[PDB]
Unconditional design. Sequence first.
Lengths: 38, 38, 38, 289, 238, 247, 247, 247
Amino acid sequence: INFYKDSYAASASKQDFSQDPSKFTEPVVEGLKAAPVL
Amino acid sequence: INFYKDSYAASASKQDFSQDPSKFTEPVVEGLKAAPVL
Amino acid sequence: INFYKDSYAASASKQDFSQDPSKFTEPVVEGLKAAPVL
Amino acid sequence: IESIIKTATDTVKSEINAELGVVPSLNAVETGATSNTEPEEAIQTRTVINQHGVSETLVENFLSRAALVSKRSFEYKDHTSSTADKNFFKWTINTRSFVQLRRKLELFTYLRFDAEITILTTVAVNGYVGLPDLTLQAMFVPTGALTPEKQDSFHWQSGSNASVFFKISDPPARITIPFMCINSAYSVFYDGFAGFEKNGLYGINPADTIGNLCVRIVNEHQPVGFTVTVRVYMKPKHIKAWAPRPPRTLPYMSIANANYKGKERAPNALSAIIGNRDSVKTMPHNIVN
Amino acid sequence: SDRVLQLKLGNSAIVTQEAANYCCAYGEWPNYLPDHEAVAIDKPTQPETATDRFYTLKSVKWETGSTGWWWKLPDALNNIGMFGQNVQHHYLYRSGFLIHVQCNATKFHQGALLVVAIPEHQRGAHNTNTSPGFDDIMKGEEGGTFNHPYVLDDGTSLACATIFPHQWINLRTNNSATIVLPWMNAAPMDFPLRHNQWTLAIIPVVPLGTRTTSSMVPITVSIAPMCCEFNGLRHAIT
Amino acid sequence: GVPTYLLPGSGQFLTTDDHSSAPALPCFNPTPEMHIPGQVRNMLEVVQVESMMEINNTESAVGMERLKVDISALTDVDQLLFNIPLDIQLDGPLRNTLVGNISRYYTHWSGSLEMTFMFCGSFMAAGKLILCYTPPGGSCPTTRETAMLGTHIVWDFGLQSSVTLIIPWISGSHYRMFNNDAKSTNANVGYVTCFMQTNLIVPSESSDTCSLIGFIAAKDDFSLRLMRDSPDIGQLDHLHAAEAAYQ
Amino acid sequence: GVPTYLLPGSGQFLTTDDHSSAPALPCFNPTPEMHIPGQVRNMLEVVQVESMMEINNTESAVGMERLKVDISALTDVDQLLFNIPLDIQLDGPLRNTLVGNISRYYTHWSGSLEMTFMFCGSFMAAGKLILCYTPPGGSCPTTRETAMLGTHIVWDFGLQSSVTLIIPWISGSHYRMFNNDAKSTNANVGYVTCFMQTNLIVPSESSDTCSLIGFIAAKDDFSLRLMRDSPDIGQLDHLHAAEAAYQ
Amino acid sequence: GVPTYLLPGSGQFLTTDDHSSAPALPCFNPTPEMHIPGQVRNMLEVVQVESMMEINNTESAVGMERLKVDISALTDVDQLLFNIPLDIQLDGPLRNTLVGNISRYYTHWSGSLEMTFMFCGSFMAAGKLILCYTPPGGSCPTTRETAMLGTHIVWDFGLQSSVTLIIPWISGSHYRMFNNDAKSTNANVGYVTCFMQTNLIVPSESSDTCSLIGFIAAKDDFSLRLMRDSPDIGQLDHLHAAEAAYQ
């Protein structure tokens, strides 16, 4: 329920389930063969 | 939301994005070639 | 908005724009030619 | 040319210009036109996709703000021997008394709007027992019509006048007054005289006065006295505005006229609106490292 | 080809060869009152060439300490010619105005004049709580003078007066200013003797200067009413 | 009935609220709209109109004298004539302009400005000026050889009496802020300076001192944000005759 | 349940509100409608009926004498007989009329009026009158040569005993206001005057003094606006036997 | 109007409520989103990053010394080198980790962990370790022959400087609880121990003492539940300059 004219007035948006943990866990460009990395 | 019988009772009307700034910035009839005006 | 079971409970009825002023202004049966009446 | 503008304009990239006959940075101010020199024509620019909205400077947004228009404090007590608002006041409605709203409206020559009126009421015990939940009557009386002269007057029976009864405990009272001028717009300024003789008021078209707001306390007086303060807030809405004006620079003197004096010194003095610097070559907040 | 201009109205004509592309106020042109905006039901008189013609006011002298000049419309014209006679014999009037302001000088003179048409120029008085009276406002053909042109005699500012329909007479550039005014009022018609829709203001922003041997440099205002209508015929007020 | 519950916010009076409310005058027919010239629907239409800067905001400058800059013939080359602070929020030559006054009802601003300068000397007066915009970071340039490393226009006095110096929107952030700290990196716009490029050269019979009038407007890339009470007006008392509205 | 919040206005009693409310008598069957003559659905039907002006509102005029104007034979030409103020809001000959009383429940009004004058002399009485409407701005005309520059009707007394002077809606604004300031430019309607055009000429056996009755109605172009309490009725006390309603 | 009734809960302020509310700045245009590197949309992305355990949480260990474990050559076989409690909720080597800090904002947790150990001795240092995870129920193993009955990895120091001991989610319940009772059957994870498998064997010219750095991360089978205030931060007073926000 949101009867306001400004969109930022809406309730919280808790449906963004997209994740990309590899920008934190694997920030190399050689994707490591799961085999030695070195 | 507006359950009143008179139309002036409505909430504010914030959707008129029409502009004509040339009635204030260019109130001549010779539209000035963007070339000397004189 | 009217959630009552009796119709007289409704809000005021302000849409009857029918007028017949001639029952007050011209209550003769000879419609007067707009020409002397007499 | 009229067009729909939702965002500020983009910038196109531009290159080197070296053309005879074409001088887009030259202008003629004498024609009354603002310069049409684009940044693309003055400097070498990039491409900018501008996504900055313009909606907060819509005239509707700029003026649909609830602004204080009236603030009356009156004593709520037994008034048998007072000289003063005896449990009620009349207020000739105007937009001229509080300078934040007045200056904004005086950016325009003509305004057409409905007026959402909000009435805030607060009570203090006179100099403790508690604050009473008093009932108030705000009655809209047209301009020049018969207003009550007593708290208990039979004028308050309000047979055709709009009246709003409201508490102190409840959310402020709120009604909408329609655009009620006899003309198609209010005259914010009026270069004229209201009467057919020459004693009439300058600057005041009474066609632009909403009415009288007659506010009483409905309750009989309590044994102790209270001071009741009534605040009235107006929010214009469904606004059309015509012919913008130079903003007011000097302080307002009266609600009845545009009379001016200015401050004693700059800023906003009669001889000097902007505060002084030492010279035209003096940079007042110069970065020095 | 925008420096030269001829204005022909009725039996009157004005030529200038140093104009600078005339102002049409708010991009509008004067028109008669259409049927879907009319209020007064009597058939109006539209004298056309008898009233829609250039009337030249008394010229004023531009001097070193001049503060500026103002004329209120239709008040400046309400005693002139058949316009003045129609105004006196009718309760209601409506018109636009074609304003032409003339000021020439030598190529060794300098000076800038702000020629601005101010709608509803409600005047303030200086340093008092008392509103301006009738004689302060209603000057007729002679017009008035600015007391404080820097605040436009109303506590606002000269510097922002270019928001109004205006031209400049820069003596180096042009010798004339032309402003076409539409009907500018909240009501479709108005009583001419108690209300002024427009104020022509002419303000010395850069003062007159030369080191030549001086001449009287006057400023001349010619005003043509446009699309004159008059309603509510009766005896003359005078 | 309907099961309901009230939430934080119920009964508050927010001055910026946007709701329908009870019409006090039922079946009121407002007067029919008439065409009026000069309708304004967005305040950015007003800021695009140029209006006079008060560049000569000095003591000894009285009233309208503050709205023009006197220019004289010099006998040294490359001289500074005037500079202009670009601080709208504090008091400067831009404050009492159309763009200045409307913008001070807002906190945030973006977009290009334009300065227009009309030379008001005689026909016989000749000269060239250089009008320089310096992006912020350093001190205001005081010599001509420093200032025109920045954005500039060289103006020849001629048949066209005016030039435009565009002040392009030159900013790391999308908006700048109208905060009181003028030296802030989110506030300071930099500087506008005017130098002689050649010299004011006039007749013995022309006035040896000539006047520039400076104008400023916003362009249509300009935007304003976060509405606030203007610091250009205030009262400490009731105005005169405000009490008579109660009598 | 439903998340809700209360707004400014909640719980107020607005006397002009328009809402459904709780029926106190469930399943009440009202009596079936019967055709009754003379239904009125808009009060502007009432103002279009002509009704008597009290033109002779003078001392020495008692009761019904105030509702007629005596006309006598004169021996000077072009004489004034009576004038009529067109101020409905203050007390004049138009106030206690159908158009006058209903309009005083409103603040704003527009549209044409009509004045009808019935000559009530003998069959043998002859005469001509000129009935002049002067638009406002000046003083009321006192000579015949001034008054008939305005809107007028020359009336011949004949088989038709009556004429109509239309007072056309002659106004700069869409509406006029019923404010107390009668000299206001948004209020004053102007004047109606009656002059002899020829003379009242009668028999020795007819009455040498004859009577006019003046009527006024609105036309159907008439409109009223902004409802208000009528200043034509008031009480300072309870009416008699009002206390017995509690006993 | 609508018949309504208020319910238990009306007007309460729940700090975890999820409602629309009144926009204070009507028609506010927020600054357009720019791509910024490193967006995080679920906090479980943060716990999957490995971060240093403070295994050497002893007196005489100062600062960064606590983040490494010194390993020396021994002259007895099968020796214990260190153990690691798996109690995140009480204070141990896992608390000031990425997985530790974020998890302490929650009460319940599930899923596998991984411990990574980087040997930071010289190139010339050789050795083998056994890294053992013991499921809970008994005492922490102190001899090598007891510990490797559990889950373990034998690590050879080589070109790859690191191994991973997976701590598999080994639990009767779907979640474990971060309660203060570390010996609870719904809390205790068991133990991690490191024994010499062979020996640290180095050059006379290499350092005879070498360092291990231990890391921990969650796997992507990890989940957290029941949000709570973190016991890792608190104040008993106002912070410095907090009063100046009111001045």
